[PDB]
Amino acid sequence: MNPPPPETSNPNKPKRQTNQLQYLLRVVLKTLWKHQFAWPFQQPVDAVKLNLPDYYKIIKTPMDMGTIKKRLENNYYWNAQECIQDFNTMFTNCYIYNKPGDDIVLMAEALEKLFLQKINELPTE
Numbered sequence: 001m002n003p004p005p006p007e008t009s010n011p012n013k014p015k016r017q018t019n020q021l022q023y024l025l026r027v028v029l030k031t032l033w034k035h036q037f038a039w040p041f042q043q044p045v046d047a048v049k050l051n052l053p054d055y056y057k058i059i060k061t062p063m064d065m066g067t068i069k070k071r072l073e074n075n076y077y078w079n080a081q082e083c084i085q086d087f088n089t090m091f092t093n094c095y096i097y098n099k100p101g102d103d104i105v106l107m108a109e110a111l112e113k114l115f116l117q118k119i120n121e122l123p124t125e
């Protein structure tokens, strides 16, 4: 009932190492990954195990920090904006699927506030 996870490597997709992508792995992801609210976002939503049968009927662009971590580790991104877009997709999915008063929404809001603080101090290329 789960889709395959988002791709985290591609032999055809070009790759480079930049200080901005290094900052996103070493500072931004690392900060969010170890946060007390990170754990529901550390892997793709398992709709079977979590008993959320409608999840992938509603969310057609799934994204999670486990996938973002692998993409950064695998040099999948060419630029920082591709990675920032994936974080925004993850937060947006959470706000669309869940009810406004749900604890997962409060957890996502806390992580997004921390995320935007760290992106505000992104170093120049």
Ligand SMILES: Cc1cc2ccnc(N[C@@H]3CCNC[C@H]3C(=O)NC3CCCCC3)c2[nH]c1=O
Pocket (backbone or CB within 6 Å): 040, 041, 045, 050, 093, 094, 097, 098, 102, 103, 104, 105
């Ligand atoms: C990404 C993600 C994961 C997830 C896991 C479990 N449940 C979710 N949604 C609950 C649906 C029912 N109402 C309560 C919702 C909720 O806020 N659950 C949280 C999960 C984390 C621990 C506190 C309770 C999920 N929704 C997601 O978007």
